[PDB]
Each structure stands twice: as structure tokens, then as C-alpha cells.
Design a protein around this ligand. Structure first.
Ligand SMILES: [Ca+2]
Ligand SMILES: [Ca+2]
Ligand SMILES: [Ca+2]
Ligand SMILES: [Ca+2]
Lengths: 673, 673
């Protein structure tokens, strides 16, 4: 039914040929683990492997290792609350959760062996045969988790705080971002259903309301992110996570924050190499932008200028030419993104994978909006610039198949509504069939491909050999869906104002669809820590900025197709609705700064009560005669040896002499006049 | 020669008629001071007043009052360094400076009498007769300060750190802003003398270089401001300064940061009233903007369309009509700014005077740039819109003085060079005669208007009666010059690129001119504390933003007067050179974040060494048998009562059994195939 107390499982693939270092490396693995302090087992693998099963042996030593890592966080400003002074009592105050238990075990297994437990890092390449280090699922918990989340309409902060406890924080920021995005998507579904009903399409009032929402939501998430990063105690872990073994370093100095010597790469040698992605991000706009346009210039040739045979047969020819082409060019540019990401020499492993996202955001910008930036800006306002393109495909179809019958070219203004219907209805359904249904069918193809084991543990070992074949849950992958989906709302939703009503329905499925993908279709992720969503905050801030320029260039260029377009009107329509974005950015950033922040106030209270605790530890008529005694003493100590200095103060000592000379000098100053 | 140890001097004006409450209030003053712990004297005033002379009586009580206010700052996160544990030894570690001595005396004199010393606040209105509370100058220090600062070309950080020690921090941020602005003004004086020599006037390359500098300088000052606010220990005093007696409050709760009960005004009731200055800032643009234009539309009538008598006599008629008018309309709008500033109900006294600046920035924007916004944008590009204006002053001059001889109207493109020559050369000289020379002459008019005193202190009392007549140094006043002077560099310097070469010469005088104004022409200011320059950071950030729009609309509208102007070219010239400002804002904000910050690292080191001090106080082969002993114990404690759980771990205990079954299960898995 349940796991047998098993913390982690290491796979350790052994090949038939070249088993000479796999057998001796198994000795080098199974005895390196026991020096850390964790017991082991070995069972039969799937075909040709050795699942070893580790658990921490003595909890009286592990309870001292949680406390040694709780103080290690609290010294670094991560935890706002200090642990309790009595050892083995702070665990009774706050328990150890299943995320903090598996994280410190994984830091014991993966470490450079000089500062922690051991190294079973697969990138060390001496442990080449170590295939996967993964924790087991809790199938009595996943059965309740899908049941509890499907029997409720809205979620609750307590229902995310038990995803923090078991799947770490890096997973539980996604479900806390998706909940705080499905609830903010009611607001463009409020007036978006309004401006589809009352106003016409391409309404300027909706293009301002959806510029206000995209900065109300984004600046409220940054205020909700430092409330979760305090309450979960994950406040600023960007400088704490373990460095990389491939981190080359120029020289080694001392850390001015801490004192311990660290490896130092000079940052102005890194900004010179980080600058080199400006010709990269221009090259990805050029390369992938030339494929989507050439595919769409052919797709407008088959549909709009054609009369020959097979209009529906040849209509699927561009879409085949895209989905074969677009992973080939993306695979080449990722070969240039990866060979540039190692050249930038990132220190922490969390800031190396968070720069592979910003170098893959440009590849996943052009593949999702150049199909719409070509329709809304080139095709629908002034599409007669395509006559070089539509004469090329005539001359491409003359030499292949007599004159081919081609009709006259006419701009169809419904192409912006057909393409937004695909990206908001069809490409959300077929994404749901790809996310959930297709891997759920793929286990039946593993069922077709189905061993001297023991009969007591036979049901449990049948599950672990099944669980090894699944892929690790890439939580950066599901952020990429909910940020591109933010793009169609911020940028292109003015062209189809129901596009927030068919994402609110999809996100409420996606809040449970992605919860299904953790349970049945992926192994349990290693519980990492993040303080933010990462490099998506610079991707939500870019689409929300662009979503005030292209959501107002659409409402000018495309509304006149339902007068000539003049260039002074467009550049004024950009200038007002981008400055309105920058003004309402400054209004929301000023209003939310005036609100009560229960994250920093929980932090700045414990910082104050630390010093007030430190203060009370070390520090545990009658005043007028103190005035007189020191005044006569100053004359007494200068009576031995002055004349213009201390004889100035001794004339009016005390106060009763002072009011006497004070009152006598009032009539003496007023009887003269 | 020097003051006789006198800390402060209270003036206490007493009138002839209504002396009934001045005599009894003098008793209520001179005995309220002695309950605090400071000695007093009374001497003859100037004509009809009573200068009382206070000093702290016993330094053994004052040394405990500095320490009670050093811990009061360190508990609030102001001071990054805790004081020494031994009492009367932290004064030997760091001494008490003359700014921190006079500040705690002024907090003893001015306080609500329930939490501190006493109340001699003149706004209490029971101490109505108390005129001025001021500390005396050190005329042996001012003689060296002008000598040391005039005998050097460049200044030094040590030469500002002894202005922190004696004139407080609120003065010494001005001299540290003026030094960090005169040194950054070399850079537009570098290529500004270049682009005046090499390129022509209205050069677009200078309009980008002066948009880059205005964000390099502004984002380097914000990095230099948290380096001074740590080193001087003034880190974040915005929530520490004393509240106002006129602060009305709705209810009283507890402070979540501290715990002590405070008076609470709900901030969303304040943002509703702070929003009301948007019709105010529109009204100041309308009111003062209609005076400067009507004055300039008359000034272009006398100079450009006129042939009658007295062209130089009538030419000074608009400038007389401005300098009489513009303080009358400004005095009315400040009557509306002050009656709105009390309606916003600010808590601290430092945030009440820092919102009177932002409500006087609009009055001091239009009075300094509407003379140039009318020339550069209305007169010089397309000035034939002034023909309604230039026909009005014809009909105004027909009915006053036969037909008047008027010549033909022609646009003179040298008006942008004549007006920038006034604002950069003439209005800096005549500002220097107004700042220094005119008050230095005004003491000779006090010498013409020149008493039963004592002959020993007669030279000292002759100086204090002279020093009472001076005005308090308003350090907000000299910021207003160096921010308007930043405006002509950021906005209008592209029209006259030598305008940075005649401000670099002026600032090097102003760095010593304003140092002369503290010594001889103003009394010593009370040493307050600020963490920033205040509301000028939102005024430098606005002029540097506007200085990428109007410094690029000038270079398009005015360069063609040396082709027709098209509106699509202007809105594109704004859109590129404002987005270039927002891009180079993001480059400088990212580069300077990667640099080493010695302010926060001095703060985040002492915060770490506090907890490491707190940690060491309370906390002051062989491992494989610990694995074995707990594994046999877990079977031992379950031997009494399981079968699928603990009998899973006991099969391979230790590690030598594990490699034995591990190696035997390698050939058993590979001899089958
Ligand atoms: Ca989906
Ligand atoms: Ca997803
Ligand atoms: Ca001046
Ligand atoms: Ca000045």
C-alpha cells in the first residue's frame, strides 16, 4: 500500500558489456552512502539495473542534522524565526515536513564530499552509471489530493500549504501562482464578456482596461510573493543554493557577508558575455520569424488565392511544413543557447537553469506570436504588401503543376478571429490531450512490453520499477504555458474579447490537470527551494509592457477594416496607451506600497524582537540639585587655576536666582521706553 | 572668541503691551527647562527680548542620554553597529559629535512632555512668546572652513564628513549631493564642448548622450545615497522622527513592528485626498502657464513687431509685468497648496514638509521652463500660430497710443540661444549676487540701525544679538536651485551644448558659495537627520524622464529651421528617444546592481555577526556501527508485536552483506541473457 519508509531510490544502470567499472563503482557507491549515515538495501531492477533503497538510519542523528541546517539558514537571513534554544524541542514546536526531510537527504547524497556527506552527482562522471536519484510517491496521498481538489470550486491557502510540505516550494509556487492567476482572470472575463456584448470588436476602452489589469495583476503577484516567501521561510535563497562543479573561477577571496572563502568570478567579465545574447535574441527573431511568415505566406496562398484541386488537401501542407521545421530550427538555436550559457559561467545551479529560460523565451516568443503578429499587423491592416509573396507562390506553383487558376486577392478580416479561436479554444483542448491523455495512453504501450523476486515486497517493487521509467517533473515547463497564455490576454485579447472567458475555464482545469500530472504521469520532484517564480517575472513584465503597445496598435490598424490609416495616428495611439501604462504602473506601485504587507512585517517584527531579547539579557526637585552640584563643582575645579568662561555660568545658578534677574531685567528693559 | 559652552539659545520675545502672560510664561519656560536636566542663564536681548542660554548641566547624565538614544536607534534598525556593552565606553569607541549633541538637546527642549523632556514648541501656542530656538555658530571653525574649501580644487569625502559632525546630516547631504553633481557635470561638459565644436547645434547624437548621462548620474546617486546613509548611520529614519501635534487620528492600535501604541490614520483615506493634487497640478500649469506665455507673447510683440518710439524702453515692460505678477499668483496657489497640505494629515513632520515641496515643484516648474517651452515648441518651429496673439497687441496698442508702425513678423531662430544664455550665464551671476552679496550688504543696513550689559561678556553678547536677526537656513531652498539647474541640462541643453560648461564653473562656486551662506549669512541649522535628499529624487527622476522627450522634440522641431515638419516624424523621434531612455535605464540599473555595494555589505555583515555572536553564546568506521545498532533496535522493538515493513530493512544490514547480495544479483541478472 505504502512505501516502506523509503526516502530515496537510486537507479544505478549497469550495462552488459563494460561491467568492469559498474561492479567496482557499485562498491564505490554503496560504501560512500554508509559513511554519511544512511542505511541501504538492494533489489532487482527493471531489466539490467540495481535499485538501491536508502533511508536515514538513526533519527537521533537526523534530528541534529535538521537543526544544523535550520541554523545554517537562519544565519543567512533565510528563516525569519530562530529555532528554539532547547535542542530536540524546535522539532516539537514546528515539525519536520516531508519536503524538508527529503531535501536534507538529497544534500547528503549530492555534495562535493569535502563539506557534506558524499557525491552521487551524475555530472561528476565517475558516477556515470548512477542513472536517477528520485523519491517515491505517496499513493495514499495522491488519491486524496485529486479527490479533494476536484470536489471544490475554489481552492484555499491551506490547500497549497500542504503541497509546500510534500512537493517542496518550487512546485508549490506554481500552484500558488496558478491560483493567484485563475482568480485574477475573472476580471478580464468580467468586462471581456461585457465588451464582447456591449461594445464591438477592437474597442479602445477594452485596450485600456486590459492594460490596467496586466499591471494590477503583476504588481499584486510581487506583493503576494514576498508574503509566501516569508510564511514558508524561503526568504531569499538565491545566494544559498549549492554551486556548480563546472564553475570556473579566477581567484578566491573571502566573503564580506559571511567570512568563509568562496570562488569569485568578476561580474564585469560576465556582463561582457551576457551582452552577447543581444545578437542571439536578434538571430532568433530573424530565424524563427522567417519560418512562421513563410509558412503563413504559403497558408494565405492556398486559402485565399487558389481555385485548383484539393483546397482542403493542400491546406494542411503549411501546417505540416511548420511542425517539422519549427523543432529543427529551435533545436539548432538551443545548441547555440546552451553553448553560450556555459560561456557565461554561472555560479549557482539555480541561476544557470534560470538563464536557459530567458534564452528560450525568445524561441518560445516567436513560435507563439509571429503567427499573430503577421496577421494583425501585416495581413489585416495593409495586406497588399504580400503581392511579392503571393506572386512568388504563383511562380512556385507554375513550375510544379498550363496556367493554374488563381482568384483575386481580397483581405479577409475574419482571419484575426479564426486564429484567436485556435489559440484560445483548440490549442487549449489539444494541449490538454497532450499534457494528460497522451502520457496516460503511453503506459498501456508499456503494458504491452511486460522475475525471481520475493513475494512479500512484490507489489511494492512492481511499482518502483514502473516509477523509474517516468520523466522528472520539469516545473519550468508548466510555467511556460501560463506565461504564453498570459501573452494572449495582455497582447492580443483586444481582437477577441472572449479570450479571457475561455482561459478562466481552462485554468480551472489546469489547476487540477497539472495536479494530475504530478500524481500519475511523473515521478516525485526533488523538493527544491525558490524565493520567486524566477525568470518569469521578467517575462510577465515584458508581455505586460508589450501588451500596451501591440494591444493599442491592433485597435487602430484593424478597427478601420470594419478611412485610411495614417502613421501619425498610430504613433499617437501607441504614445498615449503606452504612457497610460507607465502612469497606471506608477499608481499601482504606489497604492500597493501603502497597503499593509504581512510578509515584511512578520520579518521586521522578529528582527526587532531579536534585538529587544538581546537588550534585556545584558541590561537586566531632586533633579535641580544635580544642576546645582555640577555647576558649583565646575567652579570648584577651576578655582585652583576660567575667567570669561566659567564665571559666565556661575552668576545665575539654580533657577530661583534666574527668575529674579529675569524679572528685574524686564522692567529695566521697558522703563527706558 | 568662542561660545561659552552654550548649547542653545532661546529668544523669548516679550512685548510692551500684553506682558501679563509673557512674565508668567517666562516662569513657565525657565522652570520647565530645569526639570529636564539643563542649566540656564538670562541676558539682555536686542531691544525688547530675553535671550536665555541653556547648556546640559552634568555630562554624567548626558552620557547616559546619548546611550539611551543610541539603543533607541539601534532597536529601530537605524544604526547598523550596536553600541559597546560597557556603559561609558562606547563614547570612547566612537565620540559624540557636535551634531548628535545638539540634536538630543533639541529633543529635550522640544517634546510633548509625556515621553521626553519638555515642550518649548512654538506651535503649541501656549509658548507663543518663544520666538527662536537656535544653536550658536563656531566662528573659529567657519574661518577655517572657508579657508580650507577655497584653497582646494576638488573636495574629499573627509571634508564632508566633518560637515556631518557639526551641521547635521540634512545639511551634509546637500554638500554631498553637490559634490557628486559637480563631478558628474564634467561628462556633459566633455562632449558638450565637443558637440558645440565638432557638430552643429541641435545635434541628435548629443540628445542621446545627454539622455544617457541623466540616468547614469541619477542611478549612481541612489547607489551613493545608501552608502552615505549607512556610513553615517542614518539608515531609514523616515519612520523614527517625531510626529506632529496637529496630526489628527481616527483610532489607536498597536504597532506590529514595535508593540507600542501609535496614532493611526488609515492610508486609503489619505490616498483619496492625495489624489486631489491632480486638479491642483493641472491648475498650476494653467494659471502660471497663462502668465508666462502672455508675458512672452507681449515680449515678442515689442521686439519683433514694432517700429515706434522707445523699443528699448518698452522692452523692459514685460519683464516688469512678470516679476510683479509671478509672486502674486504663486502666493495664491501656495495658499491653496498649504490649505491642501493640512488636509492630507501627514504623520511625521519630515513628511509634511516633503509634500510641500512636491506641491511647490509645479509652481517652480512653470516659472522656470514655460519661458523655454514656449520658445522651443511654439515660437521657433511654427510661430505663425501667434498671429492671433500678435494681432491682439496691435489692437491693444491702437487704443492706447493714428496707425502705429508695425513691421512684418519673421521667426528669429536665435531666440533659443538668447534665452539659454540668460538661464545659464546671466541668471547664474545674478543668482550669485542675490544669494551672497545682497544679504552681505543687508547687514550694513543693520549697521545703520545701531546697553547696561556686563563688560566681560560684551563681545559675546554683541554677537548673539546679531545672530538672532538672521533667518534659519532652509536647506530645501538650495536643493531647488540644483534641481532646476539639472533641468536645463537634461531638457534644454541640446539647444545650446555649452550649457554644461557654464554650470560646472557655477557649481564649483556654488559648492563654496553655499558654504559661505552657512557661515556669515544664516544662523546654524538644527541638526536634523534624513536618509535621502527626500522629494527631490522624484523631481530628478521626472526631469530626467522629460529630458528624453523634450530634448528630442527640440532636435526635430528646431533643426529644420537651420523641409517641412511632419507629425509622424516627431512622434517617431519621441518614440525612439524615449524608449532609448527606458532601455538605458534598464542597462544602468542592471550594471550598478552587479557592482559591489559597500553600504549594504557593511549592513549585512553586522546583521550576520549579530546572529553569529548570538549563536556562540548559547551553543558554547565508527559511523557504520551506528547504522547497525539502530537497524537491529527497530527489529528489536517490533519483535514484541512489522512483517512487510521492518522485515524489508533487516535483510541487508550493514554494508558487507549488501555488496554480497549486490554482486550476486549482477550475474543473476546477466546470465539470463
Ligand atoms: Ca493545458
Ligand atoms: Ca501546465
Ligand atoms: Ca547661485
Ligand atoms: Ca544654492
Amino acid at each position: 500500500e505504502s512505501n516502506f519508509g523509503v526516502d530515496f531510490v537510486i537507479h544505478y544502470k549497469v550495462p552488459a558489456a563494460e561491467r568492469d567499472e559498474a561492479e567496482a563503482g557499485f562498491v564505490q557507491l554503496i560504501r560512500a552512502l554508509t559513511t554519511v549515515g544512511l542505511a541501504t538495501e538492494v533489489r532487482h531492477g527493471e531489466n539490467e539495473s540495481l535499485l538501491v533503497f536508502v533511508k536515514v538510519a538513526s533519527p537521533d542523528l537526523f534530528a541534529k542534522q535538521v537543526y544544523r541546517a535550520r541554523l545554517g539558514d537562519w544565519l543567512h537571513g533565510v528563516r525569519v524565526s530562530a529555532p528554539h534554544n532547547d535542542i530536540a524541542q524546535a522539532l516539537q514546536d514546528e515539525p519536520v515536513v516531508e519536503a524538508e526531510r527529503l531535501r536534507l537527504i538529497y544534500l547528503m547524497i549530492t555534495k562535493p564530499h569535502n563539506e557534506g556527506g558524499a557525491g552521487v552527482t551524475p555530472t561528476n562522471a565517475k558516477w556515470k552509471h548512477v542513472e536517477s536519484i528520485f523519491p517515491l510517491h505517496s499513493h495514499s496521498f495522491n488519491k486524496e489530493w485529486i479527490k479533494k481538489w476536484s470536489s471544490k470550486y475554489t481552492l484555499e491557502q491551506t490547500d497549497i500549504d500542504n503541497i509546500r510540505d510534500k512537493f517542496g516550494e518550487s512546485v508549490a509556487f506554481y500552484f500558488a501562482f496558478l491560483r493567484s492567476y485563475f482568480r485574477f482572470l475573472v476580471i478580464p472575463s468580467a468586462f471581456g464578456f461585457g465588451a464582447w456584448l456591449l461594445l464591438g470588436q477592437f474597442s479602445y476602452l477594452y485596450a485600456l482596461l486590459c492594460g490596467l489589469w496586466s499591471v494590477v495583476f503583476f504588481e499584486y503577484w510581487k506583493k503576494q510573493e514576498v508574503d509566501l516567501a516569508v510564511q514558508w521561510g524561503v526568504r531569499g535563497v538565491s545566494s544559498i543554493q549549492q554551486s556548480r562543479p563546472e564553475f570556473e573561477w579566477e581567484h578566491e577571496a573571502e566573503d564580506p557577508i559571511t567570512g568563509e572563502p568562496v570562488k569569485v568570478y568578476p561580474p564585469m567579465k560576465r556582463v561582457k558575455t551576457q551582452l552577447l545574447q543581444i545578437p542571439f535574441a536578434l538571430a532568433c527573431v530573424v530565424a524563427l520569424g522567417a519560418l512562421i511568415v513563410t509558412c503563413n505566406s504559403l497558408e494565405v496562398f492556398i486559402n485565399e488565392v487558389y481555385s485548383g484541386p484539393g483546397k482542403q488537401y493542400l491546406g494542411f501542407l503549411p501546417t505540416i511544413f511548420l511542425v517539422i521545421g519549427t523543432p529543427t530550427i529551435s533545436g539548432v538555436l538551443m545548441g547555440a543557447a546552451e553553448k553560450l550559457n556555459a560561456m557565461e559561467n554561472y555560479a549557482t545551479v539555480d541561476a544557470h537553469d534560470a538563464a536557459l529560460i530567458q534564452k528560450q523565451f525568445v524561441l518560445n516568443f516567436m513560435t507563439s506570436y509571429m503567427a499573430l503578429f503577421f496577421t494583425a499587423f501585416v495581413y489585416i491592416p495593409f495586406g497588399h504588401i504580400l503581392h511579392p509573396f503571393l506572386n512568388f507562390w504563383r511562380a512556385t506553383a507554375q513550375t510544379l503543376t498550363k496556367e493554374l487558376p488563381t482568384r483575386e486577392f481580397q483581405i479577409n478580416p475574419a482571419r484575426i478571429s479564426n486564429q484567436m479561436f485556435y489559440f484560445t479554444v483548440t490549442a487549449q483542448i489539444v494541449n490538454f490531450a497532450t499534457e494528460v491523455v497522451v502520457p496516460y495512453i503511453k503506459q498501456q504501450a508499456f503494458q504491452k512490453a511486460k522475475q525471481e523476486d520475493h513475494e512479500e515486497e512484490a507489489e511494492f517493487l512492481q511499482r518502483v520499477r514502473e516509477e523509474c521509467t517516468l520523466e522528472e517533473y520539469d516545473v519550468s515547463g508548466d510555467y511556460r504555458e501560463m506565461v504564453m497564455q498570459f501573452g494572449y490576454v495582455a497582447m492580443f485579447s483586444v481582437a477577441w474579447p472572449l479570450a479571457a472567458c475561455c482561459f478562466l475555464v481552462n485554468n480551472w482545469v489546469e489547476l487540477r490537470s497539472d495536479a494530475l500530472k504530478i500524481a500519475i504521469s511523473s515521478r516525485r520532484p526533488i523538493p527544491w527551494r525558490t524565493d520567486s517564480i524566477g525568470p518569469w517575472l521578467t517575462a510577465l513584465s515584458f508581455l505586460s509592457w508589450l501588451g500596451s503597445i501591440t494591444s493599442s496598435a491592433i485597435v487602430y490598424l484593424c478597427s478601420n477594416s470594419k478611412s485610411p490609416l495614417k502613421a501619425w495616428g498610430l504613433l499617437l495611439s501607441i504614445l498615449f496607451a503606452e504612457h497610460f501604462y507607465l502612469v497606471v504602473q506608477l499608481a499601482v506601485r504606489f497604492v500597493l506600497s501603502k497597503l499593509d504587507s504581512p510578509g515584511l512585517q512578520k520579518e521586521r517584527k522578529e528582527r526587532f524582537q531579536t534585538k529587544k531579547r538581546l537588550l534585556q539579557e545584558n541590561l537586566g526637585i531632586e533633579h535641580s540639585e544635580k544642576i546645582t552640584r555640577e555647576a558649583l563643582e565646575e567652579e570648584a575645579r577651576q578655582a585652583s587655576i576660567g575667567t570669561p568662561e566659567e564665571m559666565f555660568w556661575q552668576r545665575q545658578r539654580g533657577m530661583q536666582e534666574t527668575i529674579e534677574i529675569g524679572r528685574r531685567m524686564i522692567e529695566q528693559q521697558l522703563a527706558a521706553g
